Write a protein that binds this ligand. Structure first.
Ligand SMILES: *[SH](=O)([O-])[O-]
Lengths: 6, 87
């Protein structure tokens, strides 16, 4: 998967 | 498992302070992969790594692609309610 910081 | 409703407060110049992974294209839910120290999620508590985010502010994330969830999550402001379940 991707990994996205929010 | 139990679905928890978790509150988080943040100013607009702040991030949520979480990272997410997963999404419909991967056949898995939107999952919390990291909680960043000192940021709103960490300070407010209640979220944990491995939680599936079922909804945020009443907006269902159960069948969202990764980028959709990123959009929805990133557009929430102020007082934010997550509904999560640890998987
Ligand atoms: S936090 O503002 O909800 O602790």
């Amino acid at each position: 998967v991707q990994d996205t910081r929010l | 498992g139990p679905i928890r409703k978790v509150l988080l407060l943040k100013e607009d110049h702040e991030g949520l302070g979480i990272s997410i992974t997963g999404g419909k294209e991967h056949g898995v839910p939107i999952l919390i992969s990291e909680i960043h120290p000192g940021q709103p999620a960490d300070r407010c508590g209640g979220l944990h790594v491995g939680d599936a985010i079922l909804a945020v502010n009443g907006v269902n994330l159960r069948d969202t692609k990764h980028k959709e969830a990123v959009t929805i999550l990133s557009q929430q402001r102020g007082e934010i309610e997550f509904e999560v379940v640890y998987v």
